[PDB]
Design brief:
This is part of a larger assembly, with three copies of chain A, one copy of chain B (110 residues), one copy of chain C (83 residues) and one copy of chain E (215 residues). Chain A has helices at 25-51, 78-85, 90-106, 115-124. Chain A is mainly α and 146 residues long. Chain A has one domain (1-108). Chain B is an all-beta fold and 110 residues long. Chain B is built from no helices and six strands. In chain B, a hairpin with a 4-residue loop joins strand 2 and strand 3 (31-33). Chain B starts with 14 loop residues before the first strand and ends with a strand. The chains are: A mainly alpha (146), B mainly beta (110), C alpha+beta (83), E alpha/beta (215). It is classed as transcription.
Amino acid sequence: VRYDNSGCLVKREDLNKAEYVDQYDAERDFYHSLREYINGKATALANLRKSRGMLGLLEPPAKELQGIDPDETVPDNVKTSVSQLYRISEKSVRKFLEIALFKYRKARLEPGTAIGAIGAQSIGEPGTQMTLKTFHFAGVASMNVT
Amino acid sequence: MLSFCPSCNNMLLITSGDSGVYTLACRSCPYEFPIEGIEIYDRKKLPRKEVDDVLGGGWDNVDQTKTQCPNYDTCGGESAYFFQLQIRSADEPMTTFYKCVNCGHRWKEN
Amino acid sequence: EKAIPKDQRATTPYMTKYERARILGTRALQISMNAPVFVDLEGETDPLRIAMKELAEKKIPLVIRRYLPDGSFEDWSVEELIV
Amino acid sequence: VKTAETGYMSRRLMKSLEDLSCQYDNTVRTSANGIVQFTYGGDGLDPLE
Amino acid sequence: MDQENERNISRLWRAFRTVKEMVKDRGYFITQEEVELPLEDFKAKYCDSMGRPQRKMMSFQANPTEESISKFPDMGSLWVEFCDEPSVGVKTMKTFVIHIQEKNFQTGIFVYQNNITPSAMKLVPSIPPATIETFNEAALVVNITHHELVPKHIRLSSDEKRELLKRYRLKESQLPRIQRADPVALYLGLKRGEVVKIIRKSETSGRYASYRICM
Amino acid sequence: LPDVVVKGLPDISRAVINIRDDGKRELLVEGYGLRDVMCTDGVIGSRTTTNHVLEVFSVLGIEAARYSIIREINYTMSNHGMSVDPRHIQLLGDVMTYKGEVLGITRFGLSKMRDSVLQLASFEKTTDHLFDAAFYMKKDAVEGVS
Ligand SMILES: [Mg+2]
Ligand SMILES: [Zn+2]
Ligand SMILES: [Zn+2]
């Protein structure tokens, strides 16, 4: 919902005003990136379809004949060609969204995790493999920063 | 200054006498070189300390090799600067450190 | 010192790895203390494996008391904690 | 020289982060219940996952 | 020489712009017509004939704005005053406090040139109704708020502080702290117990908010 | 006499003009003064960082201090190929700066707020810490893992 700093609703003009940034913002960016990826796939299909002459339906149609399928005038040739190159079924989209949401949920840090200890070892274990003497590529002749 | 008496060869100094005379008396020996409109000057040269040009980079002089970096999808780098060190016990082999020429990403392949 | 009512709960509905490990340990200790088991053993004698079988069947009669840092706690049964 | 020199570094880092654990309200807190991070990494996401 | 004077006018102009921004974002009636002051225009307005900067006719009145007064009911006017003498003496801050108390100023900004007397700290905190903030002309040449390494610190009212302490079910001792005399706390005029919202940005986790409490 | 400073800040051992593989000639100085370099004419103070965390802390703030800590640590292990997730470094910076000042992992730093005389004595300086605790009549609870 993105409540205000005092607990009120934002006015839809101050949604991204940067003083109302809170938690759930990472989740919102994840959802927006999912939508951007699906939009990229859909736009690729639309660009293919409009490169075949037929209508590239990136935006939903709105007219009196909106109910009819706009692929009828196509003589059954570039239709099967398009279905040969890109064919995105609804089951595929739902499965991708299911997998992505499941993975995002599973990626959350679990309560009780010894996250401090894990970070300490994750910063310290690579620290035992690097030399205390600074070893440089022979020929750089840059300043000797430790 | 760095001057010495002719009699005892000790180092000469400037002392203020009567009428404030800046005579070059020699301690430990009755020697007195007064100043009668004579200038004692000691000049030593100093370095110019010219400008220094941009540090830049001399990576042209560094041993390269044919290794594709782990970040090959972002940068298609077929070469990587390297240097080998034996940072293990003498029974493990040597360790080779890399640096992609296309992104600068460092990694050690051991 | 105040239990959150069940109708609303802010903690995750999924079981954590630590919750699963501790539930298995507690159930296995109970079984090793001759507690009755609610699963069909099929000739299994190890209390730990019996506890894993009950967890797979979701027949472990323990609840998880998750204390929030503010001192409150919400109770989650092993059954309702989804894996 | 690195062996012992780096050995204490790891132990020292642990001594500082020994009692930092994710809470059930999704906050990282000391053993004194004081907040270090309101959300781990600003994300709440496990690096292992 | 002329170079010293030219550097000095430019430097004090930069300091004045930083002070104006600081009092603007603290919440007060200041706009770009006096913030973005052309150095030449500032020179043609605060530098006189023979060309010496004079630091008595830039002391300006700062008044709370409608949003700021609505959020924070207790906020009076601001006095920003620039010193002239290198070493501040007893008399000058004495008459400065005199001005504050005779004009009923809630807070006062003191921006001296070089140094402050060690006896000033014994005389400055003696003001029940008001507060004194002590700044250097050389220490605010560039405002740290515009630095890329400084996240947007946002000061929260008592209502927002109470709401935050209840949304997370916290005492004040459990919040992360921010020092008094911290460079950003001094810029925003944080007082003890004043929770500030921090809008920090990360490369791998996006934009997110943390909170700190002033000691 | 021929050793005194007439021009420049008497904090910089040397300055050196660098090139970032472009036509931009940035300069990095080998000094201990960041505010002076930031306020120097012709230098952009908005983008001017030093690798000294404590210098960043005293000039820019504790938040900039933790940013400097995270960037310095990450860069340090990025020059040795040490692929550590940045969340570990973020947690290290947060635990180093959440008191409002940059507290180290040195023995003096550990005496930040822990009050755990057992943990402190296990770490280092056992006898002095124990005797100070006994003299002060300290009442430390048992809360840490140590
Ligand atoms: Mg071996
Ligand atoms: Zn002689
Ligand atoms: Zn590369």
